[PDB]
Amino acid sequence: IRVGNNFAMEINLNANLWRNFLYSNIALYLPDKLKYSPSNVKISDNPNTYDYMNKRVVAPGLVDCYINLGARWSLDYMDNVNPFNHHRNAGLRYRSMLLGNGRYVPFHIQVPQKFFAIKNLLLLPGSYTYEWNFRKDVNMVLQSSLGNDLRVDGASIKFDSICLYATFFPMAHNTASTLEAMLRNDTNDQSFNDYLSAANMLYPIPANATNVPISIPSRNWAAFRGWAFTRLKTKETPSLGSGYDPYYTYSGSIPYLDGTFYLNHTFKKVAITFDSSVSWPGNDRLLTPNEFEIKRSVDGEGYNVAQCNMTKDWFLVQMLANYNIGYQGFYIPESYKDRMYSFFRNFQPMS
Amino acid sequence: PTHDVTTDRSQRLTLRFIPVDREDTAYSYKARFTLAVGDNRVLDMASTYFDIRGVLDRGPTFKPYSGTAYNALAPKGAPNPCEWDEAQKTHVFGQAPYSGINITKEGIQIGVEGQTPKYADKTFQPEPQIGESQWYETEINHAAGRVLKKTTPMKPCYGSYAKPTNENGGQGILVKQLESQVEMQFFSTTEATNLTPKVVLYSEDVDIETPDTHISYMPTIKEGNSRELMGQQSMPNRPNYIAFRDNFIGLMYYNSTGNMGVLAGQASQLNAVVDLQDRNTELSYQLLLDSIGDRTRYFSMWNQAVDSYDPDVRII
Amino acid sequence: GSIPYLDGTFYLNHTFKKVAITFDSSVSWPGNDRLLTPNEFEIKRSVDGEGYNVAQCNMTKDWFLVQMLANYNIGYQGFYIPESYKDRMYSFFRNFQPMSRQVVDDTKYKDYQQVGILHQHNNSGFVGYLAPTMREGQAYPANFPYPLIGKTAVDSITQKKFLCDRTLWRIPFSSNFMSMGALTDLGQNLLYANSAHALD
Amino acid sequence: KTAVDSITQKKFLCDRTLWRIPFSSNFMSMGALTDLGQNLLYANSAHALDMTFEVDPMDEPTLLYVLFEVFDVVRVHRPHRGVIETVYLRTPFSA
């Protein structure tokens, strides 16, 4: 017979589930400057190897169950880390399981055509050659959720066969010949436009560099539409224009090619000066009309929006660049104008 | 409408196009086709695509799951039943979960066949999954279990795997002469040394491995089994999802002037694809699908599954 | 339980291989060399020696074209995600979820042993044997399943399938498999015809 | 009641997006061919551009990805069976 209360041991379950959440998702994905090498474990010398990224032991006290309690706050350590190189990346989580669960995968893929002239083109009758160059680089054809070099890590791909398919609408022959005759005029030319509609230049920024001056030499600027700038990483961006990049030891998400941009918060200001004396937009337009102050560290005059450090000039421009919102009041744009890659869908102010 | 919309003649819907001439570099390959559109047919090039077959090796650094596969409910510092040589005597840290009837020199009696004592098959019996089912600590005079030998390298239980080498699931390194080497080790009470052995530990050599875990705490750099290597603690490897990219980015050379594609007539041979390397055809297609459709939805045929971080992981 | 005949909770859609439709006992429908295998509606293929599967599954290119044209008028100008009002609950693409896995290749992997459920001892001394009852055993290295990843990954074979619940395999009686009206163009040719046709 | 003397840090994160600055006189989209883009057709003069970005310092070589938004237009003519003819034009950055 037990004399008194029974024996038991107390656990904090919700804290242990929340301490497992913050470690597996945030503390293991910290920058490598916060980690250290474990004792008595042979670790690889190459930092782009999975044997490195797995075995760099991180302290749980860096991101433990008490970090920023009651603060909706992304870590300053984790702002510059690619959030799409993560195992909760639900696209890559879906794309990994769409092939299978094993190392050795025989695949069967249908690759879409993306070149805008020949993407929506309605071909008329005729025999055409149709010749395409395909990649085989395992850091380009594949995507890992850690960003390790898949050339060193033994990932191989081997393209056995290939076929071109083409679905034809079975149009009536005296109707598909009237449409054929109409579409062979010089007045009925099928005209297309690239959706990005931009000539894209990559300018290098050195390490720990604050000032980035670029310079377009001299040109007629007629039919110019605007700018759309974003910071990238040299590690994460392959040298396109070359068919094979031997210095590209990275197989994570490529923000240059997929739209997974994340270094937008690393911009302070933008000074656009046409022809070295004409500041743009000039004309005393903005509250600081010679530069596009994107954020302010030290604000005494109080020109910030949204309980963050983004300025009132730059929040006006970005709500007008995307939604025509800003001269008749700021409000939530509707869900059809506010797409996935838009400004307001992703603007998340924190404090 | 009846007529003037759909033909009444023998016309195919989908055509199959064998490559005319394929050439290979060490980093790229090229596929020339004849995109032959017959008489009175229109072809929207949105309906055209490349069907590619092949063999993908994801490499050993592919881990499609968090945690481990083997003994996940085990404690991370929990060792397997192992042996080691100290200073040269061999110590045994083991467990004997099975409860039998009688113990002779042939092993443990698991039952009878009439009056003949049926013993345990040393290849797979007693099973390390079968022990006692009641919770109260009854008297167990004739227990038995399985122990890894001193030649087997010592691993924690969390994440340990050995392949089975018989039909009945028993794991153990077979040797050629193809007979297993499972030695029997008889143990009795220390103050008892008639002599009746209480515990029979079937020692064995398994092909032990940690296919998805690693050690987070090594107490000893030296080789060989030791008492300090019971305290080694196993951590699961980090999950690495290796796959093709969203909308098959990186399979087709866009905006490479050396790897430009060709759509031309067979006679004039003037390439209608004029490609410029300061275009981003990939990002032009990633932003086009956003403006025309709900981008959160998953379309497997074009591998249309958008990269999306968890919103509670980025912003804590 | 749920009655799929009445509730609309259809779930055995994946158990179809092919469909052969013949009008008047000789005229194979649709005829006209329409499909890639034009004498039948191949819904799925396990062999796939000629290269006729979509969606990284085993559904054929003929059948995925027909189902995206029966519901959505999508397929002749490129396959894309249908808009959210065309894609209802009991529709095709809302419910079509293609899958794949790898299992062991028992005829190629030289160390395969078919270990039944009586002898699979993963979570050995921490999980009750063959029951949700109390634990029994010892903290012992597992033997199931075979590792598909790592440096010691087994020789694997890939199984592909799809599950498309809640839906009906629509084959429209139209000459281009599209919905250009409720009274289809092949139903108006047989209109005022006074001709009976056998259907097999 | 024993709270420390605290200082407030504010920031924003805006992923997945491009910082759009439209080349329009009121920063709005009244059309793809903007009014400042037509003001430079009738001016008929070449101007140089000197943009200057101030960024946060990172311990890593980074790149700058500026989209100079143009009209990347292709007009496709097929006059005869097997004949394909295309005229490309993008303005300003013609190539």
């Binding site: 959706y195 | 409408p1 919309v5 032009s284 | 009206g181 | 938004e69």
Partner: peptide, 28 residues
Amino acid sequence: FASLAPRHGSRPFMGNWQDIGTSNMSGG
């Protein structure tokens, strides 16, 4: 071209006249 259009009732279900071309660009 009313023989190519589906018949809602006895009237041809035509589209609009000005819905022929596209005009979408990256913000414009």
